[PDB]
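Researcher: We plan to redesign the surface later, but first we want a full-length starting point. Tokens attached.
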């Protein structure tokens, strides 16, 4: 159609937990996003990494993305890429920007748990209540098989337990110590960092945004209730046509009762802050961020496809 999203460097979309480029080689993780961007002049590639793994380490998603980035550069003739990651994908993108600064032009994170997820702490805690530890083995096997079956390439490198640990708040803090970034504020300050970073002589434009559909709206007897602001109260069709809508409202309620404050169901506003924070006001739950569960979203939710398209134009204007 035009070149509204024509960035200088190829855009690589990076999925998070459970992800792959196409679930069962059928359902796109970034629903309708690659198509939209390409129609608007962008060169876009979608990474296919382990849906369950840590980001650092020999078998981690980081080295996987690094290797993938190199194949994209070789195929396009480009020298750098613009990394756009969702959820854990943002942490994976930070890893590549840190170890291979010369291959990255920018890093954009969408609903990325830079400080971990209180829901991860929760799930990890639940498993800890099994004195035999057997549930960790059983559930891991179940989740790992899920990863293999849904992976577009049936990637057998799945480690659900490592993935869970990676997303906890305590581990995330350690990750930030091992992979510092000028785009990050001080731990526990709920502040972002700088809009750019210069690593090894290579400058990166840093961006982020978060979904805050889940808002704490009432507290009684120690219990805190939340409201899904992405939907028209009770009657919104999104509650019926997209099962993740009520599910994230539920996990989001657990989050608020663990002191997370506004969140998207699994990532808090504070945890998602990185680089130039474009917005933390989108009335989105975690999957709305990627136009998911087939493009269904609450009546009060902004268009995620348009938001991403506009960001591509933003990158273009910024020179990357
Ligand atoms: Ca949705
Ligand atoms: Na271009």
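Model: Full-length starting sequence:
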């Amino acid at each position: 159609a035009d070149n509204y999203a024509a960035t200088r460097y190829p855009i690589i979309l990076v999925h998070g937990l459970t992800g792959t480029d196409k679930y069962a080689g059928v359902l796109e993780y970034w629903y309708g996003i690659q198509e939209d961007l390409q129609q608007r002049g962008a060169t876009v590639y979608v990474a296919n990494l382990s849906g369950f793994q840590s980001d650092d380490g020999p078998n981690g998603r980081g080295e996987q993305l690094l290797a993938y980035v190199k194949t994209v550069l070789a195929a396009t003739g480009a020298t750098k890429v613009n990394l756009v990651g969702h959820s854990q994908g943002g942490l994976t993108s930070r890893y590549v920007a840190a170890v291979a600064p010369d291959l990255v032009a920018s890093v954009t994170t969408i609903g990325t748990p830079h400080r971990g997820s209180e829901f991860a702490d929760f799930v990890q805690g639940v498993l800890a209540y099994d004195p035999t530890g057997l549930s960790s083995t059983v559930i891991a096997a179940f989740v790992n098989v899920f990863g293999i079956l849904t992976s577009s390439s049936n990637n057998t490198n799945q480690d659900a337990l490592a993935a869970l640990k990676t997303l906890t708040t305590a581990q995330a803090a350690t990750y930030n110590q091992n992979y510092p970034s000028a785009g990050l504020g001080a731990p526990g300050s709920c502040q972002t960092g700088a809009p750019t970073e210069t690593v090894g002589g290579n400058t990166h434009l840093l961006y982020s945004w978060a979904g805050t559909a889940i808002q704490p709206t009432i507290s009684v007897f120690g219990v805190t209730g939340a409201t899904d602001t992405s939907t028209i109260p009770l009657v919104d069709p999104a509650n019926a046509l997209d099962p993740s809508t009520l599910a994230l409202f539920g996990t989001g309620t657990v989050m608020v009762n663990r002191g997370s404050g506004q969140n998207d169901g699994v990532v808090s506003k504070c945890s998602a802050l990185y680089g130039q924070v474009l917005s933390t006001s989108y009335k989105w739950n975690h999957l709305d961020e990627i136009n998911q569960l087939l493009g269904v979203r609450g009546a009060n939710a902004e268009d995620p496809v348009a938001v991403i398209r506009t960001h591509a134009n933003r990158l273009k204007l910024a020179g990357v």
